[PDB]
Amino acid sequence: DTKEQRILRYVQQNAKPGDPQSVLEAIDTYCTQKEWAMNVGDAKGQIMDAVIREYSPSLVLELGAYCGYSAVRMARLLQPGARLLTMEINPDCAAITQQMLNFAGLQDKVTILNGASQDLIPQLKKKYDVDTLDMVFLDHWKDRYLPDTLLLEKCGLLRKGTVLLADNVIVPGTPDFLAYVRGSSSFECTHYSSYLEYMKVVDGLEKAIYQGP
Numbered sequence: 001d002t003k004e005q006r007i008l009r010y011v012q013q014n015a016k017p018g019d020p021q022s023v024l025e026a027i028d029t030y031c032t033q034k035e036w037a038m039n040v041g042d043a044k045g046q047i048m049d050a051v052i053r054e055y056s057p058s059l060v061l062e063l064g065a066y067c068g069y070s071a072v073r074m075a076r077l078l079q080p081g082a083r084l085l086t087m088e089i090n091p092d093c094a095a096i097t098q099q100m101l102n103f104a105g106l107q108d109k110v111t112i113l114n115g116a117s118q119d120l121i122p123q124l125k126k127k128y129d130v131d132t133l134d135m136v137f138l139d140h141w142k143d144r145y146l147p148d149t150l151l152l153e154k155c156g157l158l159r160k161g162t163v164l165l166a167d168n169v170i171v172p173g174t175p176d177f178l179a180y181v182r183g184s185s186s187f188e189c190t191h192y193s194s195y196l197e198y199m200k201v202v203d204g205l206e207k208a209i210y211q212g213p
């Protein structure tokens with residue numbers, strides 16, 4: 001088995017079905033005590049929770065699902081009827097994520113899409129019936145942050161006030177994306193310093209609020 005399967009089995013055996021908080025706690029315990037993994041983690045996850053609660057988004061897009069940690073974290077705070085779409089290129093991870101969300105009781109709130117973000121984003125409107133997005137969580141691969149931001153704009157998926165929240169802008173770092181949003185009048189940007197998941201290493205999140213064309 002893989003590390004990702006081990007994390008899923010740990011949750012299934014150490015959390016309560018239907019209890020998203022217990023799922024997060026189990027993942028964080030496994031990843032602290034047994035095997036590190038690239039979940040957003042609790043430190044940065046607390047900042048994400050504060051953002052989600054501020055904005056109460058009705059439609060969230062996540063780029064990069066992995067094992068479902070961030071999807072559980074965000075979906076547990078959504079209001080009735082609000083929805084998360086998450087894109088994941090790795091089919092094994094997509095299957096873990098679906099199972100993780102089912103265990104957590106959040107499957108009615110989330111649609112896990114299996115493919116590359118750059119291929120799926122242009123299909124959101126016609127195929128997935130999206131008008132505009134309220135929030136985007138960027139957490140897939142550093143070199144895709146800038147091109148997929150520009151693609152979201154091209155496709156008419158951002159509106160005035162859409163919140164982009166980007167992980168890992170310090171480690172590994174996303175210098176092109178940061179330079180771009182911080183220099184563009186189309187974004188209002190805030191940096192939230194924190195720590196790399198499970199590590200005493202500085203990292204951070206960037207919030208970039210779209211201001212229209």
Ligand SMILES: Nc1ncnc2c1ncn2[C@@H]1O[C@H](CSCC[C@H](N)C(=O)O)[C@@H](O)[C@H]1O
Pocket residue numbers: 038039040041063064065066067068069070071087088089090093115116117118139140141144
């Ligand atoms: N272009 C792309 N489109 C979709 N998923 C991608 C991608 N490039 C990488 N990924 C996926 O992005 C994930 C990064 S890890 C995601 C962690 C998750 N947000 C959490 O915090 O729990 C991996 O599972 C990887 O397969």
Ligand SMILES: O=c1[nH]cnc2c(O)cc(-c3ccc(F)cc3)c(-c3ccc(F)cc3)c12
Pocket residue numbers: 038039040064139140141142167168171172196197
């Ligand atoms: O790619 C990532 N996507 C989404 N979130 C990630 C994250 O939160 C952390 C890391 C990360 C891994 C190892 C490390 F020492 C420091 C940071 C990565 C990542 C970076 C470079 C890599 F080569 C492979 C993984 C990702």
Ligand SMILES: [Cl-]
Pocket residue numbers: 040041042043044196197198199
């Ligand atoms: Cl952490």
Ligand SMILES: [Mg+2]
Pocket residue numbers: 038039040139167168
């Ligand atoms: Mg990350």
